[PDB]
Amino acid sequence: AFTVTVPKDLYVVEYGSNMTIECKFPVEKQLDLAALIVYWEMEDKNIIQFVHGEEDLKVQHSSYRQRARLLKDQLSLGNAALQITDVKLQDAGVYRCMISYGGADYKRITVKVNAPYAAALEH
Amino acid sequence: AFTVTVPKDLYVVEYGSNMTIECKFPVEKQLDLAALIVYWEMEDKNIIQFVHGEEDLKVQHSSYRQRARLLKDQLSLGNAALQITDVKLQDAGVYRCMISYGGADYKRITVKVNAPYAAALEHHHH
Numbered sequence: 157a158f159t160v161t162v163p164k165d166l167y168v169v170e171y172g173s174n175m176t177i178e179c180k181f182p183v184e185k186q187l188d189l190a191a192l193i194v195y196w197e198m199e200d201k202n203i204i205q206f207v208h209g210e211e212d213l214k215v216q217h218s219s220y221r222q223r224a225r226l227l228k229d230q231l232s233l234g235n236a237a238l239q240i241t242d243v244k245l246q247d248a249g250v251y252r253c254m255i256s257y258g259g260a261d262y263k264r265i266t267v268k269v270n271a272p273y274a275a276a277l278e279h
Numbered sequence: 280a281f282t283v284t285v286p287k288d289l290y291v292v293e294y295g296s297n298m299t300i301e302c303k304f305p306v307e308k309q310l311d312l313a314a315l316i317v318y319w320e321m322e323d324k325n326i327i328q329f330v331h332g333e334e335d336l337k338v339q340h341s342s343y344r345q346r347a348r349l350l351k352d353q354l355s356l357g358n359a360a361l362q363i364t365d366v367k368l369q370d371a372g373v374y375r376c377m378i379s380y381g382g383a384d385y386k387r388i389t390v391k392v393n394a395p396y397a398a399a400l401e402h403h404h405h
């Protein structure tokens with residue numbers, strides 16, 4: 157019954173701050189890397205790929221360059237936590253974490269961005 | 280690697296007919312049923328969950344009630360085919376087929392629904 161769970165399926169973040177979004181997956185033992193596949197995505201844009209126990213960014217969408225990282229240490233605890241720094245309005249939307257570690261599952265997370273008079277994104 | 284391929288990323292179906300949408304996954308030699316996990320989704324609504332070699336429709340969205348089935352016989356050829364019966368105008372949209380079988384991957388498929396006026400006018404009015 158391998159299940160990905162999320163403590164929060166909604167995050168409300170203030171423009172310019174850092175954000176950390178969590179997916180949990182069952183991990184009893186010392187973790188078997190390169191048996192673990194973590195894919196994070198927002199709308200249809202890859203943010204993070206983690207396969208063969210190594211970060212893959214060669215598919216990462218232009219936007220998330222230099223602002224997205226997976227907290228690789230939390231993986232051992234069954235926590236695929238995605239940290240986005242310097243949150244933009246374009247970061248508002250639906251995120252998906254897809255995790256394969258024996259079984260496979262996903263959860264969606266909605267991110268909402270509060271912002272000061274952001275004429276800038278309008279255009 | 281592990282890649283899901285889709286021979287068609289666009290289907291044009293007539294309202295009321297049946298539809299069969301394919302997602303191909305590499306299967307070298309005999310298939311390992313316990314390793315396979317297939318999720319069919321449209322928008323953010325689950326259509327088919329397939330784990331432990333058996334269809335799980337416990338999370339199946341109300342719209343697809345009694346019209347969604349995964350053709351289990353084509354699974355041996357590396358074909359995760361979703362069949363939708365009595366196609367509706369609400370079935371138009373982007374489908375996703377997420378497959379785990381060693382590696383993992385997904386592909387998107389766009390479904391367009393052609394309909395005569397009467398069917399369209401009902402869906403419109405409600």
Ligand SMILES: Cc1c(COc2ccc3nc(CN)c(NCCc4ccccc4)n3c2)cccc1-c1ccccc1
Nearest residue numbers: 195254255256260261318377378379383384385386387
């Ligand atoms: C589906 C899934 C994943 C998916 O991880 C990956 C791994 C490699 C990879 N390469 C690519 C690039 N081609 C993508 N996505 C690109 C999408 C795309 C589609 C159409 C055209 C263009 C691009 N990838 C996604 C990871 C973990 C658990 C699962 C899972 C499986 C079944 C049930 C539940 C969960």
